[PDB]
């Protein structure tokens, strides 16, 4: 439950998948990592919960809202996460 921040250097793909969001009744969670991708290089781990994306609290977001914030991110991808 300890928190950390990442600022991944672009361009995407960022190297991960999500599950969850409000429309799935679970918090947004890192659900897969591409081997050697940028998220893995920043030691993001499967199961870590995404608390914010670009400073916006992730709690209210749907799955698609989080995906699009990530996909359409200009420059670096800033997120805060909670360790599983």
């Amino acid at each position: 439950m300890s928190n950390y921040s990442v600022s991944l250097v672009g361009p995407a793909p960022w190297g991960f998948r999500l599950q969850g969001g409000k429309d799935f009744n679970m918090p947004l969670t890192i659900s897969s990592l591409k081997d050697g991708g940028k998220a893995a290089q920043a030691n993001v781990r499967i199961g870590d919960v995404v608390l914010s994306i670009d400073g916006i609290n992730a709690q209210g977001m749907t799955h698609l809202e989080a995906q699009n914030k990530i996909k359409g991110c200009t420059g670096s991808l800033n997120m805060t996460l909670q360790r599983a």
Partner: peptide, 6 residues
């Protein structure tokens, strides 16, 4: 719904 790589 589907597996979407980001």
């Amino acid at each position: 719904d589907q597996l979407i790589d980001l």
